[PDB]
Amino acid sequence: DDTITTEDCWTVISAFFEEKGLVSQQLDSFDEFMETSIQDLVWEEPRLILDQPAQHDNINKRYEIRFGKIYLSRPTMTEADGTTHAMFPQEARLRNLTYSSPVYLDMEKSMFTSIDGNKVHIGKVPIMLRSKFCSLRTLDEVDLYKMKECPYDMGGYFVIN
Amino acid sequence: QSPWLLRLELDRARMLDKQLTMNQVADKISEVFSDDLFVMWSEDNADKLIIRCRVIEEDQMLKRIEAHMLDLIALRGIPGISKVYMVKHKVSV
Amino acid sequence: SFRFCLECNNMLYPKEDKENQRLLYSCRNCDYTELAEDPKVYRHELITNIGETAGIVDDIGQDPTLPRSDKECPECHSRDCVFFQSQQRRKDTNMTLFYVCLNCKKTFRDE
Amino acid sequence: DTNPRSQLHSVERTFDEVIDPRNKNRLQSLIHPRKKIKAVKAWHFFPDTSTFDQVFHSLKFVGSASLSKDRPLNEQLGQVNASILTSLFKPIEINPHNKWISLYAVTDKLSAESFRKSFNSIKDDNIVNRHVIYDHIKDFDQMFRGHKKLFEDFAISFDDISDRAFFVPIVGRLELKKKRIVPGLVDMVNRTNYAHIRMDLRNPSTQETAIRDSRREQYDPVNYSSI
Amino acid sequence: IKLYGREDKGTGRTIKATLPYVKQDIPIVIVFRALGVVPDGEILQHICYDENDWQMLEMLKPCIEEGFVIQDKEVALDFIGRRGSAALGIRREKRIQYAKDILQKELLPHITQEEGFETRKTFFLGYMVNRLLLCALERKDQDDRDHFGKKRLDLAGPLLANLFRILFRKLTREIYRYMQRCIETDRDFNLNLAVK
Amino acid sequence: IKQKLETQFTCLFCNHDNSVVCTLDKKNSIGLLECKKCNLSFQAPINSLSQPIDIYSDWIDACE
Amino acid sequence: GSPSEPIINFLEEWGMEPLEDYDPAQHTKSTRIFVNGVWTGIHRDPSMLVSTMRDLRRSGAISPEVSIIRDIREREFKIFTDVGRVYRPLFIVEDDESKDNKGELRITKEHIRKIQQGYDDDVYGWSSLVTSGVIEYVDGEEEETIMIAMTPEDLQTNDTAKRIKPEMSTSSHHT
Amino acid sequence: HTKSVYDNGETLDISLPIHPKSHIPQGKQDRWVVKLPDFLDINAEPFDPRPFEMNVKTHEDKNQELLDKLIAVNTVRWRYAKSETGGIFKETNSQIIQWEDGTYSLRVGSEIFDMFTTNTDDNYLVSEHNEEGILMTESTLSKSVKLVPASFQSTTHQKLAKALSAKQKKESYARSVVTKEDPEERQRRLESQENERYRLERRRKQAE
Amino acid sequence: TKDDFSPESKGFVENSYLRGLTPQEFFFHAMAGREGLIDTAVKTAETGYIQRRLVK
Numbered sequence A: 001d002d003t004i005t006t007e008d009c010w011t012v013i014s015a016f017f018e019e020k021g022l023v024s025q026q027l028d029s030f031d032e033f034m035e036t037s038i039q040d041l042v043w044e045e046p047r048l049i050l051d052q053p054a055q056h057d058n059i060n061k062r063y064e065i066r067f068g069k070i071y072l073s074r075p076t077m078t079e080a081d082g083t084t085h086a087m088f089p090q091e092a093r094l095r096n097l098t099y100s101s102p103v104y105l106d107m108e109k110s111m112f113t114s115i116d117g118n119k120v121h122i123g124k125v126p127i128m129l130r131s132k133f134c135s136l137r138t139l140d141e142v143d144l145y146k147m148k149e150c151p152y153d154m155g156g157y158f159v160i161n
Numbered sequence B: 001q002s003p004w005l006l007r008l009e010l011d012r013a014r015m016l017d018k019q020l021t022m023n024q025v026a027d028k029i030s031e032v033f034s035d036d037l038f039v040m041w042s043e044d045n046a047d048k049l050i051i052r053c054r055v056i057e058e059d060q061m062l063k064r065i066e067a068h069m070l071d072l073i074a075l076r077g078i079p080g081i082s083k084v085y086m087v088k089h090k091v092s093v
Numbered sequence C: 001s002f003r004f005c006l007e008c009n010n011m012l013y014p015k016e017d018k019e020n021q022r023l024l025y026s027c028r029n030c031d032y033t034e035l036a037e038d039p040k041v042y043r044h045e046l047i048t049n050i051g052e053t054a055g056i057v058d059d060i061g062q063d064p065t066l067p068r069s070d071k072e073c074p075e076c077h078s079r080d081c082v083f084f085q086s087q088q089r090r091k092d093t094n095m096t097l098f099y100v101c102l103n104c105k106k107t108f109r110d111e
Numbered sequence D: 001d002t003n004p005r006s007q008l009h010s011v012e013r014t015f016d017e018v019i020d021p022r023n024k025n026r027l028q029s030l031i032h033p034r035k036k037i038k039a040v041k042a043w044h045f046f047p048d049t050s051t052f053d054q055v056f057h058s059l060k061f062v063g064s065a066s067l068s069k070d071r072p073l074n075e076q077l078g079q080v081n082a083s084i085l086t087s088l089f090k091p092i093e094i095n096p097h098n099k100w101i102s103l104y105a106v107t108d109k110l111s112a113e114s115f116r117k118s119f120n121s122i123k124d125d126n127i128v129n130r131h132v133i134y135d136h137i138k139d140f141d142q143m144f145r146g147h148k149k150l151f152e153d154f155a156i157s158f159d160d161i162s163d164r165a166f167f168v169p170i171v172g173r174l175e176l177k178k179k180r181i182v183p184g185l186v187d188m189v190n191r192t193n194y195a196h197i198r199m200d201l202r203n204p205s206t207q208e209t210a211i212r213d214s215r216r217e218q219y220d221p222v223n224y225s226s227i
Numbered sequence E: 001i002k003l004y005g006r007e008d009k010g011t012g013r014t015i016k017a018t019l020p021y022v023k024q025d026i027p028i029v030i031v032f033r034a035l036g037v038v039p040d041g042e043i044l045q046h047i048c049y050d051e052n053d054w055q056m057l058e059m060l061k062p063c064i065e066e067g068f069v070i071q072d073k074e075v076a077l078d079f080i081g082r083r084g085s086a087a088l089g090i091r092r093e094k095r096i097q098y099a100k101d102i103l104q105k106e107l108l109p110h111i112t113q114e115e116g117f118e119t120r121k122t123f124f125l126g127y128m129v130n131r132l133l134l135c136a137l138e139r140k141d142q143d144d145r146d147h148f149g150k151k152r153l154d155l156a157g158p159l160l161a162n163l164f165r166i167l168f169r170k171l172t173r174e175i176y177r178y179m180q181r182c183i184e185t186d187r188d189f190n191l192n193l194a195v196k
Numbered sequence F: 001i002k003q004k005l006e007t008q009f010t011c012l013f014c015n016h017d018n019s020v021v022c023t024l025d026k027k028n029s030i031g032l033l034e035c036k037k038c039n040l041s042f043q044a045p046i047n048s049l050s051q052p053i054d055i056y057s058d059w060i061d062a063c064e
Numbered sequence G: 001g002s003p004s005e006p007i008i009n010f011l012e013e014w015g016m017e018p019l020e021d022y023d024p025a026q027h028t029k030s031t032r033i034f035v036n037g038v039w040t041g042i043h044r045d046p047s048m049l050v051s052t053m054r055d056l057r058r059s060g061a062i063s064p065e066v067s068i069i070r071d072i073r074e075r076e077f078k079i080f081t082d083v084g085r086v087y088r089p090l091f092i093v094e095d096d097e098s099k100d101n102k103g104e105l106r107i108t109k110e111h112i113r114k115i116q117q118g119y120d121d122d123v124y125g126w127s128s129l130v131t132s133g134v135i136e137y138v139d140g141e142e143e144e145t146i147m148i149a150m151t152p153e154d155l156q157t158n159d160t161a162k163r164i165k166p167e168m169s170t171s172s173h174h175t
Numbered sequence H: 001h002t003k004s005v006y007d008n009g010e011t012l013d014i015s016l017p018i019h020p021k022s023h024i025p026q027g028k029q030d031r032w033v034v035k036l037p038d039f040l041d042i043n044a045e046p047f048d049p050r051p052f053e054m055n056v057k058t059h060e061d062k063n064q065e066l067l068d069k070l071i072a073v074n075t076v077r078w079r080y081a082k083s084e085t086g087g088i089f090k091e092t093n094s095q096i097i098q099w100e101d102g103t104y105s106l107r108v109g110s111e112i113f114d115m116f117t118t119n120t121d122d123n124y125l126v127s128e129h130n131e132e133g134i135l136m137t138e139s140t141l142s143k144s145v146k147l148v149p150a151s152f153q154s155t156t157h158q159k160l161a162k163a164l165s166a167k168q169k170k171e172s173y174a175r176s177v178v179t180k181e182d183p184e185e186r187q188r189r190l191e192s193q194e195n196e197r198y199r200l201e202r203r204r205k206q207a208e
Numbered sequence I: 001t002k003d004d005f006s007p008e009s010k011g012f013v014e015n016s017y018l019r020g021l022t023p024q025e026f027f028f029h030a031m032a033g034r035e036g037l038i039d040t041a042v043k044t045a046e047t048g049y050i051q052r053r054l055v056k
């Protein structure tokens, strides 16, 4: 073979920065969170239980609800007149909005008795910019310019108010 | 007296460095303990410097006596003065 | 070293017979009693050197972070060896070196 | 190779490439991939037919319950001893909270040797009435762990004359620790176990033999199916 | 696992172990017996791994002497159960069950959570006591608190996960309270009103 | 040396609370529980590691 | 963060024996095996095990951010898949004695040319280098067991303006 | 002198039925306990090619299918082989290989797995008799045997490494969805309906 | 390597600022500078408190 010069080391470092970037840890952690952590936290305590040994003919009734799947969407903006539309970070910056997306949870109800259920909105989670769940992840260089976003911006932050 | 025996091996080098005599240590033990303990000591020429003792269930009592002896037997010196150094002082006279 | 009971696995405390004048190891959880071989009931070391060379393993020659010398082995006269200082880490510990051969793997000094 | 035909062909290929243990030349042809060392001897790997009906458990002593450690017990039972190899275990449970195991053995060496020789030579239909008396030795506390899969553990026994190796299933593992009997319960302890147990050797009944053959029919139906 | 007693002071150098939901420290021999290994020899087998080291055996001797008073598993569990900070007046069997619960769970939870799996807990206890003795006998330096390979960094993921766990538990408690209030009226709630 | 301590235990005969006093003597290895209202006395052996909770639990076991 | 179940499966496959089958008197020379701080078993040939684990991690079978630490002095073998460990990449020097390339970098000019092109000669980026075994990640805890050359010129053995490099003469040879 | 606790002398006249054994160990009643690895399975049932072909299961998950394929091709099996003389003989696909160093290896087909033997004391094999509630010992388990793959280049090790590497790569629990309206619309409309029926119920109760 | 007591292994910088430091010397020098900054920013409060008590 041939020896490895310092320029080869800088080529390897350039490959590293081409693949990872400078804010990869933030985006990777947030993507891991949104992808698995919310579902695992919901499934940590998946069963609420209420019992009532009614005697008023003894009927032991158990009421229990199960938590199912987590559904996420792209961030949306709801106006005073009632309409909705897709939100982008520049609009959130200009109008002092929060860049966040709704979270839906499947709740299943069962009515246990012994003688002896769809998507519910549970809240809005702020979205980290340029992550897998951000609207700017897909946009190419030209639409990024049309959206008034700087191509040198790297993301890794949230827009609250 | 009791069948239990208590002998302790003392380092020859540091005992000679401190300039101490075995008889002095024997008299110190005799004074602090009166006749409650019979004491014998090997002479100077012995290969290993030893000093035995005999009391006059007492294994734990002998252990406590040995711990007390190791702790608070003062051979010589001023209590509280842990170490002493020699210093040279330049004085104008 | 202290022995254990052969029937209920507890510690064998020493005991002295008044009538027989003998040292016996007896378990306090039963009536078992075995005759003691030596009169060394207890030994306390004020200044000790154990653990200085006791920290030795048989795979220490595979460590790449250890320095390598060319000192002569006393047993097989090899030309490669690995040295290190004392494993004891008190303030009074000496700075002497322990050498380990790469064939017989014994610990030897330079004095 | 997701094709079922491909999997079947691979199975028959593996079946056909078995090296005959008597074929010394083919055995020497085989070479270790890493060690690069030639083969010396070979043995066939086969299951056992006569033992699948029975239930086998791996029994181990934990800690001080070791027979070698208990020197007076080992001296009394003999310094492999046939008494150890012919010992009896009797699990008795007064309640779910309190449980122990009773151990029995043959103190006499001649009786234990005769019983072991008779037991290890059962290949005919004539069994002598060996009224062997077993004496209680010691009791231990027990815990049990079950295997989720059937053949989680298997013990291998060898047979040099046939060049085979017979393996038996293991259902569970039993661990024993030394138990110190409470002095306030010795009155109830004396009413549980027995000082002696007599074992009588008799030919198995026809109905029990048929039941065991029916149990073995799951493994081997060619030679044991009822007609 | 504290090591009480100063050098040449305080008589014996006993080793007491702090346990969760237990008001006062506990000697290592008693909890070792409570886990289910009574003989002292096997306790030393678990703790030490080389019989010729007489110094660690000497340092464990006061613990053996102190724990000699307890000699059975059940009395050891009961002794655990008296100090377990629970309501006063609990019966002996219920105290033993409470000790079994507080011993199976919340004692080294990262090892295991199921029953009859306490052998690994005993081995880990022996390992901890061995490390404590190795540091106490000046055989090893105390651990470097500022070592960076012993530190961890929490990014957006773990922080948001902890926050979401707290908020989701609050939301679940609100759902529970609303359900309890609504069952009084006995109505087929839409379940889209309980969630806030 | 006898040690007298005021305890917040409940007597099972008079039902009055905060009227239980534990008296333990380590020299003779004994422990006495006395009710300030019922005047009943309970005796149980104690060990070197004994605490008032030990004697209280012993009294509970004796009562049932 | 990575799951520890494949790690336990690999360890049990390669001869690790559980704690219930462990006797400290019998095993006076075995190595304790920890996984995420949990003592899970023992082993008597730690060298083959650590070699196999490291080769598997370098091939991509185990995640590259998994820590493989062998403490020879304390007879311990620790593995970490926890979240929050800070790591950095390093070149790998061929340390196999039986190989001809001993004492030399695994990365060659072919790798550099492939990186410059962007594809393999039957995308080739940083991850391709990491899973080819020429680069690997190490955290602060694993750094205590490795020996690092500062520059590739250091792998092979009087101007008043040029800086002076350490001699490192205390050892006769360096691996 | 620990006196014997049991001295009643009561004796049970229990007789156990015993069956002849197909084989008898020679020279030593020793057996080796072997832990079953994940890549190896035991099929005591005789090999039946047609049901085996008809019961092959295909799954969308490539890792599970690959694991099933590996364990199936590596499963220890046996079948009846028709001899050329007209008799029937038991034929197996598994063998035991002993090298010159004295070590043993389990061979199935072309795959070879090494054996690591650890000596174990006070370990025996017993037979359970549930109908009588007693345990009858069988032999001694002197050595514990672990099965280890021979080399990296073995196909079993490569398939296991591939399956375990690609098993942890697939991780996606949350499922995306498209919101068309305000997520709080359901809450406010149901609150309005509940307030309306509260007013109606209050009016009815005042009118009742 | 382990157990190295040579000057370069324990923080002796043999180069000048004009010549340029090696990475090991750079890191050791940064450690010493960090010590200086911490010492100043920590002793300032104690000195201020002593001065206030003296004045009062």
Ligand SMILES: [Zn+2]
Binding pocket: C005, C006, C007, C008, C009, C010, C027, C028, C029, C030, C031, C032
């Ligand atoms: Zn005893």
Ligand SMILES: [Zn+2]
Binding pocket: C073, C074, C075, C076, C077, C078, C101, C102, C103, C104, C105, C106
């Ligand atoms: Zn040598």
Ligand SMILES: [Zn+2]
Binding pocket: F011, F012, F013, F014, F015, F016, F035, F036, F037, F038, F039
């Ligand atoms: Zn009262």
